[PDB]
Design a protein around this nucleic acid. Structure first.
Lengths: 293, 108, 185, 305
RNA sequence: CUAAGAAAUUCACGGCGGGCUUGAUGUCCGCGUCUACCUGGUUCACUGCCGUGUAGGCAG
């Protein structure tokens, strides 16, 4: 038959905004008096993040909670479609629980992809990941500098613990809350660049920061096998796999390798694709949106 | 068809003898929804003036034509029991798509 | 010069090639001002004059020691994972220049220039410098950050006429021609 | 009747002090026979030297203002006259009533000859546009362009040369400059079937004409019937009531080289349809064809739908 | 070669004097707008410069 006339999915892996701060190196344990990056109006209207003279490194503090329960949709019209979508995602998580998806999300949390202009040219970028369930730390994590990369993903001796934590949260059996901060040495007075509004830079109170949707977009860079090639690296999850920076929308509707074309014969026609395309459809269900007509 | 032709004739007669179309006091909505009855190029246009001065499509025009077709004929929850109402709805959708394809080439 | 290094832009899902080209060009200018000298030039092997595109390759020309010094400097730090490098090899070629083409494409800067240089008025500078003095360029460009002012500027680049032989001349701190010629291949 | 190779568009054409009456039973827009005669006169002036032919017209009527007035609470109109000079004495004796009108028409002419074969494309249009500005199109002078936004857009559009999607794009590009107008086309078949509809008592054509263009109000045994379109009565050519004559036979002819006939108007039907509602523009060209065996001398538009 | 071809509506003028529109009023009851998103088009095909002239190197 047909799909739902209206159907939608709430997002998972909730990001906040990332408050920027400036400080000195080897002060990473004491980032509680690092002054926030102030935007000033100095004349041609420019907005430059003037770091202080006694402050070289940038620390971008944000938080991330994963929710779980990616199967159940928000508001589905058809009563005969919700149960078959739940059965589809249930057989998916029963044949192979999304541990490789959680590994790739952990690798997204490894290198500071949420930093976009403030990641290039950096000497060393250490992300510090906490895990807080009651109001204090449970098992913190420190990350290396060569394991940062941008495309080299591998089973690291401690990234497997972060990946199994993200999988245990996303499974739907107890959510997690991670305070992800990132220290990076950029340059004294060098203009680190957060997001900008309609120049007007985006600013939460008494600081500058990055939008939540930009950090989420940087954090869901999972998509590897799209039919054009896979040489340049992984792109971010999108139903049509679109990328504005490269400038050409991939995953064309003439081919049936798109998300709307893969789910539609996954649930109706029972044409289950390969494990990478099932990972793609499921990772396109962890980002939400308004599907259907 | 006569209603669509009268609307097209009014839209052609409006933007022919009124060259005033630019920034001014009380001209905010006359740049996006006014893509049909829009003036020529300005005197202080920018480099990418194909979006902020004159967008190259009737972007707000299609929803307005759909809303005008929905308001001009009070369709109910039982207006498709036979093909009589649904055929008029399909003809209205086709006429709206044709008017959209015609108005898309207006900014060029 | 006789030794060239081809640094190819790996295509990036996060950034267009113009973005990484501008970042590597800024790091190249920073490495050249940290090095000094007038002997290092740049060339763009994947130039397209029709599409006004710089391509994905940056070919630096210097001696072997300058390439071997710039390989081991932190001017590539953080960009080793965005790029792909070849080896310092000998050039196989006609010669051409790599020139920066400025323009007075803004009448307002020349209006304030005439006000500062002859103590005139705004209306007299408006009559003397009209708005038709703006210069259009069909040239490719890179976008970098400014020093004294802080507004991002585009450098237009023009690859000059192909001449069979080279002339003696120095280079600027951007790898561009200030008299020098670079071999085109 | 031959389909043209090209549709030479004559632009926005303000003509003043035209003939409004144009027929013993109509008073509105001038006759389309004036337009076909205008194109034949323009052919006789420019086309013999340009080695082309000119047959049809597209009558669009961008604006139309009559010289009329509604006198003091009446449902009719009267015509504005012009004061004539005096006789041998100061009589102001004869006052014959004829109407005037100012109309902005824009014609499109069907070309047949050696348009692109031996001549350029823009130069022929420039020559015919600067030739049609020194004559009169309906009984009144063709006003030239002296105002601002200098158009001169005599689009000498080729039709039979090009692919089909490019040809449809050319038609919808030429229809863009017919933007507020209204093309006039004959509907003889519509008047015929509307005559067969009300043939229950007496199938007179002059009664089916005089009971269609009106608003026939008729209640429920409380409405007016649904308006099928913008139907107008037009003169649709002449009809002879005297046999043919010799050139020098009939006293006081216009010239003694062509024969004379005593004729009488024929009243056909017409519609003012928008130029978007036609498939091709060459469908709405007015040609005049004659059958000198009988008395019919009829202008019409073939392929009007 | 067009219901073709042709055409001066002119001169003058006191609208004007008056006036009570008014009385009264119950708008009522009730509600799920939801989910997602890289502004890094150039918020000016820039900005003060060695000579009033284009010839530039210090966060350029």
């Amino acid at each position: 038959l047909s799909t739902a006339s209206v159907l939608a999915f709430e997002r998972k892996l909730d990001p906040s905004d990332a408050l920027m701060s400036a400080g000195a190196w080897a002060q990473r344990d004491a980032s509680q008096e690092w002054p926030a990056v102030t935007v000033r109006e100095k004349s041609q209207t420019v907005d430059v993040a003037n770091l202080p003279s006694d402050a070289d490194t940038l620390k971008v503090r944000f938080t991330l909670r994963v929710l779980g329960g990616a199967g159940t949709p928000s508001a589905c019209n058809d009563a005969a479609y919700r149960d078959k979508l739940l059965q589809t995602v249930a057989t998916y998580v029963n044949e192979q629980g999304f541990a490789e998806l959680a590994r790739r999300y952990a690798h997204n949390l490894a290198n500071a992809r949420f930093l976009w202009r403030n990641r290039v040219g950096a000497e060393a970028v250490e992300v510090r990941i906490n895990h807080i369930r009651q109001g204090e730390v449970a098992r913190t994590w420190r990350f290396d500098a060569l394991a940062i990369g941008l495309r080299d993903f591998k089973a690291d001796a401690e990234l497997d613990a972060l990946a199994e934590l993200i999988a245990s949260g996303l499974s739907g059996s107890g959510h997690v809350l991670l305070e992800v901060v990132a220290f990076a040495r950029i340059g004294d007075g060098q203009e680190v660049f957060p997001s900008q509004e309609l120049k007007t830079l985006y600013s939460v109170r008494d600081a500058a920061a990055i939008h939540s949707q930009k950090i989420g977009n940087a954090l869901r860079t999972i998509d590897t096998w799209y039919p054009d090639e896979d040489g340049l690296g992984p792109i971010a999850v999108e139903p049509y796999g679109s990328v504005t920076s490269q400038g050409k929308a991939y995953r064309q509707p003439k081919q049936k390798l798109d998300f709307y074309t893969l789910l539609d014969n996954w649930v109706l026609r029972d044409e289950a694709p390969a494990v990478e395309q099932q990972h793609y459809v499921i990772a396109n269900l962890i980002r939400g949106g308004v599907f259907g007509e | 068809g006569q209603i669509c032709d009268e609307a097209l004739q009014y839209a052609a007669r409006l933007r022919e003898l009124e060259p005033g179309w630019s920034a001014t006091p009380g001209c905010q909505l006359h740049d996006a929804e006014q893509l049909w009855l829009d003036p020529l190029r300005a005197q202080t246009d920018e480099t990418f003036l194909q979006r902020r001065l004159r967008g190259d499509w009737p972007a707000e025009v299609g929803n307005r034509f759909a809303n005008w077709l929905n308001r001009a004929v009070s369709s109910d929850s039982q207006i498709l029991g036979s093909p009589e109402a649904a055929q008029w709805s399909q003809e209205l959708s086709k006429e709206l798509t044709m008017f959209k394809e015609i108005l898309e080439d207006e900014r060029d | 010069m006789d030794h060239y290094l081809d640094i190819r832009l790996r295509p990036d899902p996060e950034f267009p090639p113009a973005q990484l080209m501008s970042v590597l060009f800024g790091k190249l200018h920073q490495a050249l001002v940290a090095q000094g000298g007038d002997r290092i030039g740049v060339s763009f092997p994947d130039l397209d004059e029709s599409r006004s595109r710089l391509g994905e390759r940056l070919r630096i020309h210097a001696s072997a020691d300058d390439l071997r010094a710039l390989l081991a400097r932190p001017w590539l730090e953080g960009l080793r994972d965005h790029l792909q490098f070849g080896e310092p090899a000998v050039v196989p070629t006609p010669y051409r220049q790599v020139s920066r083409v400025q323009a007075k494409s803004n009448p307002e800067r020349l209006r304030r220039r005439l006000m500062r240089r002859h103590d005139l008025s705004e209306e007299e500078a408006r009559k003397r410098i009209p708005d038709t003095v703006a210069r259009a360029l069909d040239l490719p460009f890179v976008t970098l950050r400014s020093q004294s002012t802080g507004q991002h500027f585009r450098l237009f680049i023009r690859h000059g006429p192909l001449q069979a032989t080279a002339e003696e001349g120095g280079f600027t701190c951007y790898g561009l021609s200030k008299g020098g010629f670079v071999p085109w291949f | 009747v031959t389909d043209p190779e090209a549709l030479l568009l004559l632009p926005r054409l303000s003509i003043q002090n035209a003939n409004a009456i144009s027929s013993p039973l109509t008073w509105g827009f001038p006759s389309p026979g004036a337009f076909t005669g205008f194109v034949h006169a323009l052919q006789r002036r420019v086309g013999i030297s340009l080695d082309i032919e000119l047959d049809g017209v597209g009558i669009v009527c961008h604006r139309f203002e009559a010289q009329i007035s509604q006198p003091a609470g009446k449902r009719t109109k009267v015509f504005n006259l012009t004061r004539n000079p005096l006789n041998r004495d100061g009589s102001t004796a004869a006052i014959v009533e004829e109407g005037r009108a100012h109309l902005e028409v824009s014609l499109l002419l069907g070309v047949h000859g050696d348009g692109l074969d031996d001549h350029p494309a823009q130069e022929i249009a420039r020559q015919v546009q600067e030739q049609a500005g020194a004559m009169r199109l309906a009984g009144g002078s063709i006003l030239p362009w002296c105002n601002e936004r200098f158009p001169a857009p005599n689009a000498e559009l080729l039709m039979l040369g090009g692919s089909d999607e490019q040809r449809r794009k050319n038609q919808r590009r030429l229809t863009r400059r017919l933007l507020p107008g209204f093309a006039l086309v004959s509907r003889e078949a519509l008047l015929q079937q509307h005559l067969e509809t009300l043939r229950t008592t007496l199938p007179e054509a002059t009664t089916l004409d005089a009971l269609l263009d009106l608003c026939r109000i008729n209640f429920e045994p409380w409405q007016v019937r649904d308006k099928p379109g913008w139907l107008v009565p037009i003169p649709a050519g002449y009809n002879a009531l005297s046999p043919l004559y010799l050139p020098g036979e009939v006293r006081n002819a216009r010239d003694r080289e062509t024969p004379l006939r005593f004729v009488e108007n024929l009243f056909g039907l017409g519609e003012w349809l928008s130029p978007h509602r036609v498939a091709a523009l060459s469908d709405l060209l007015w040609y005049h064809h004659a059958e000198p065996d009988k008395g019919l001398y009829r202008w019409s538009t073939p392929r009007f739908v």
